[PDB]
């Protein structure tokens, strides 16, 4: 499989209610391993996965150092964008940043990213070539110049192509039991009569990891993408994910519908049918 390490940062200003809020979370694939919350008591990077709890005091020390470094950078960022967009100082604004790296099945660098948004819209982002920026508006363009002169892409390239993949790998081995485990989907189907001439057919895909999955309904082998309810893949809170696909079916016709399940955990895609 392909693996990823990602950092999610969220900064939200609170006009007259104190310092801006700063939340940071960090994931390895579909597992969250650490967090930082500007309102938490500790004021340090906390572990959110059992396999990072093993890290020594220096790691926590250094990640807590970096994490509030980021935090400060985001407390200043709220103010610059405000000036850039000529915004009142009365209203709350949101900044969002995301960076990380992807590795292939060989555990080798595949792609590196660094994205930034202001009030839910793309602000500035690092291209796949790690040498050029996508500025959205002129304000983003002033940021682009500034990051060009400070040679930030070069610095970020070394990070995503190196220390990122390097520590991703370490995490992978360190948490081998739950990071390198691929749980196939526990699948099952339900039949609910809606009226005397119709009935709901529900395909279930429970306790799987990773999150990726293809839950499809087909009638007479042809896909029913237009008339199927499909819920977004949701967390079960036990490290696994759940999902379902539902199709309303004319009673006496359950047998021509077939649910299809595609997941890394299965050697072969499942085809279930009501019967």
């Amino acid at each position: 499989g392909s693996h990823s390490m990602r950092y999610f940062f969220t900064s939200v200003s609170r006009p007259g209610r104190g310092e801006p809020r700063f939340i940071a979370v960090g994931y390895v694939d579909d597992t969250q391993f650490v967090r930082f919350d500007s309102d938490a008591a500790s004021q340090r990077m906390e572990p959110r996965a059992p396999w990072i709890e093993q890290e020594g005091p220096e790691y926590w020390d250094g990640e807590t150092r970096k994490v509030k470094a980021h935090s400060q950078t985001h407390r200043v960022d709220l103010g610059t964008l405000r000036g850039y967009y000529n915004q009142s100082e009365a209203g709350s604004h949101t900044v969002q940043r995301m960076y990380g790296c992807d590795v292939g099945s060989d555990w080798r660098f595949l792609r590196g990213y660094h994205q930034y948004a202001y009030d839910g819209k793309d602000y500035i982002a690092l291209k796949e070539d790690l040498r050029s920026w996508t500025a959205a508006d002129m304000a983003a363009q002033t940021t682009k110049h500034k990051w060009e002169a400070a040679h930030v892409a070069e610095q970020l390239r070394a990070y995503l192509e190196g220390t990122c993949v390097e520590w991703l790998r370490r995490y992978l081995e360190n948490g081998k039991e739950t990071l390198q485990r691929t749980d196939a989907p526990k699948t099952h189907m339900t039949h609910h009569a809606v009226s005397d001439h119709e009935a709901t057919l529900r395909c279930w895909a429970l306790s799987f990891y990773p999150a990726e999955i293809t839950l499809t309904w087909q009638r007479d082998g042809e896909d029913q993408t237009q008339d199927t309810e499909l819920v977004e893949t949701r967390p079960a809170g036990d490290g696994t994910f759940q999902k379902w696909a539902a199709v309303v079916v004319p009673s006496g016709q359950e047998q021509r519908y077939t649910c299809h399940v595609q997941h890394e955990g299965l050697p072969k895609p499942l085809t279930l049918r009501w019967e």
Binding site: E63, K66, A69, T80, L81, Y99, Y116, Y123, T143, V152
Partner: peptide, 9 residues
Amino acid sequence: FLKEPVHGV
């Protein structure tokens, strides 16, 4: 493992 340093906008 977080990245350092981080430049503002």
